[PDB]
């Protein structure tokens, strides 16, 4: 019982925004990925520090709240003011909308940028279940799971065993080409024993 991000987000994840949730002989582990979560946080921050920036233009009074001005000039002031009110109110609602979409789509981008990294790591040693997880076709102890997180997994070390546990019939497993040395071979105990060794005995 374990799932990924194609379905739902984990609520137990609190060291960061993205992480690995694994499962093996020793049990479940939930540990955040630090590089990916900082890359998301540091771009949302980049938005804030661009919109929080202040304006340094100072406007003075042209109206007069205590002592009203000429009806014409006042009406034109009111007309300009209410027209400017409309522009900023529009420019504001839109900016929040765009930046909220770019924010939401920003975090989705960094989840996949991490998923598609772990994919290339495991090379030909795991498969995509389809729900944001990787069925690993080789025994992976708690030390091996941490090798996936800190980008040290070596596909070579487990490749040959993983592909054989993947390309199967019934138990089974593909077999190597018997030596091309000129002598016919027969299969016995997972090794190509030579046929000449079965034709030099005696009859009964």
């Amino acid at each position, epitope marked *: 019982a374990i799932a990924g991000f194609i379905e739902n987000g984990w609520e137990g994840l*609190i*060291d*960061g*925004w993205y992480g690995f949730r694994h499962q093996n002989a020793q049990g479940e582990g939930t540990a955040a990925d*630090y590089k990916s*979560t*900082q890359s998301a*946080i*540091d771009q*949302i*921050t980049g938005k*804030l*520090n*661009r919109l*929080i*920036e*202040k304006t340094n233009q100072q406007f003075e009074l042209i109206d007069n709240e205590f002592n009203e001005v000429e009806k014409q000039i006042g009406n034109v002031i009111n007309w300009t003011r209410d027209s400017i009110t409309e522009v900023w109110s529009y420019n504001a609602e839109l900016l929040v909308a765009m930046e909220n979409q770019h924010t939401i789509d920003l975090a989705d981008s960094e989840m996949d940028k991490l998923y598609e990294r772990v994919k290339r790591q495991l090379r030909e040693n795991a498969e995509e279940d389809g729900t944001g997880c990787f069925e690993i076709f080789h025994k992976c102890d708690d030390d091996c799971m941490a090798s996936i997180r800190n980008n040290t997994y070596d596909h070579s070390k487990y490749r040959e065993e993983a592909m054989q546990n993947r390309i199967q019939i019934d138990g089974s497993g593909y077999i190597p080409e018997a030596p091309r040395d000129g002598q016919a071979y027969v299969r016995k105990d997972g090794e190509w024993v030579l046929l000449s060794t079965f034709l030099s005995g005696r009859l009964v």
Partner: antibody
Amino acid sequence: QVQLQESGPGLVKPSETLSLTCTVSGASVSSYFWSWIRQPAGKALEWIGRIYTSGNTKSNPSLESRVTMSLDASKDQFSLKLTSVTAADTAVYYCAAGRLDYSDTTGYYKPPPLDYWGQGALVTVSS
Amino acid sequence: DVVMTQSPLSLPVTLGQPASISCRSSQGLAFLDGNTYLSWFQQRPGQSPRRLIYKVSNRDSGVPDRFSGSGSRTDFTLKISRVEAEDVGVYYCMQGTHWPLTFGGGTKVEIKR
């Protein structure tokens, strides 16, 4: 009611492993961010790195190649190891602590606060 | 790296007069949680530095009234209402929003008595 006490060699030879250790009085190491700040003789404060229990030795790039931090929860001591030491690493080495709120998910991705400081240890790097 | 620039770099004041210290950051210092993490630090003769102001304006407990922090997002100012003989020392500003923590150059305050 918390105090941080630095300890370690007063001089380390060039290219050695400068080691120091901040011993915590009256608090649990589990509940803080732990920073090492060094101050060379009459220069700006330099922030080395920060760790917290469950691991995450986020460090400054100038020294990351050489820095190594760990902290023991039974002995209550932040520790530090600077490999291949130079005359530039001659400095006062204050250690510092900062509040750690477990639920502040966004707090592990921000430089830790510098709530408490130690007395500072002098490590002069010569032969 | 966020660049903390303080001014002045030597601030000799007259015992009992006010003064200010400006700290300009190369970047905005806002964070997702809505707080901008600038701090002010006072390192007096032969001592560990202690924190006067955290989060631009909040003064730390156990600090004289005359220390009040202020600032926006790039431009910040530490204000001392009334510098007495006990405020001698060096004053730093640090950003605490961006990796890595960085400190200002420092301002040397010396009392004119």
